[PDB]
Design a protein around this ligand. Structure first.
Ligand SMILES: *Cc1c(COP(=O)(O)O)cnc(C)c1O
Length: 226
């Protein structure tokens, strides 16, 4: 039951926030609906969920159109998969957020392809904080430079950072890696305007991520099923 699952996940987020002295409202639940049908997203919407994350462009855009045409309003769609230049127009025309900016050229493409009547596309810079097996994300040493360049693009709005840490079973290392991201996030916050989003944490490291300073957790299977 998606409604029951959503409630359970929200309770876990709230508990984790309250335990470490944070307000539950500080944490956004991003429901990750990749590979799940529109009907499952519709159940989540009926249960009050408004923020959805998609990883594949055409799948995501088809869903966005489906709910637009149904006359559902108030939804927020986040693109959280790797972006390729040949699919960027679709992201720029339909999504509200993109978490996966890891090079300047793709940001400039999105900027140039974003219609002026839409709000600026909210973007996060993706850091490869700990994953030797991933080619997504920049090194922290490259952040100052990329952030400055992306920040000038008028049809984007730089809102913070994202990371997908390497899988980690130890809580200590979950927390330590998440803190590296929180420190970088805090640093950006001190000089850049409207830095308020740290997209960090999934089901298995949710508590460590929240304790470290995440503002947004990305949950799929625990809401929608395997
Ligand atoms: C798939 C995915 C998730 C959700 O993972 P689950 O195992 O289904 O909870 C979260 N964030 C990103 C970027 C993903 O690709």
């Amino acid at each position: 039951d998606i409604a029951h699952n959503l409630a359970q996940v929200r309770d876990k987020i709230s508990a984790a926030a309250t335990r470490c002295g944070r307000s539950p409202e500080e944490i956004t639940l991003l429901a990750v609906s990749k590979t799940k049908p529109a009907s499952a997203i519709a159940e989540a919407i009926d249960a009050g969920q408004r923020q959805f994350g998609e990883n594949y462009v055409q799948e995501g855009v088809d869903k966005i159109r489906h709910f637009q045409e149904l006359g559902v309003t108030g939804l927020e769609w986040h693109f959280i998969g790797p972006l390729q230049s040949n699919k960027s127009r679709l992201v720029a025309e339909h999504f509200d957020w993109c978490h996966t900016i890891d090079r300047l050229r793709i940001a400039t493409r999105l900027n140039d392809q974003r219609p002026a009547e839409l709000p600026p596309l909210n973007v996060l810079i993706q850091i490869n904080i700990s994953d030797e097996n991933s080619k997504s994300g920049i090194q922290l040493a490259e952040l100052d430079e990329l952030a400055a360049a992306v920040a000038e693009l008028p049809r984007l709005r730089l809102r913070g950072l994202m990371a997908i840490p390497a899988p980690e079973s130890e809580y200590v290392r979950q927390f330590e890696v998440a803190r590296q991201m929180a420190v970088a996030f805090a640093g950006l916050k001190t000089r850049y305007p409207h830095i308020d989003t740290l997209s960090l944490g999934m089901s298995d490291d949710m508590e460590a991520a929240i304790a470290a300073g995440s503002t947004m957790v990305r949950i799929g299977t625990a809401i929608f099923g395997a």
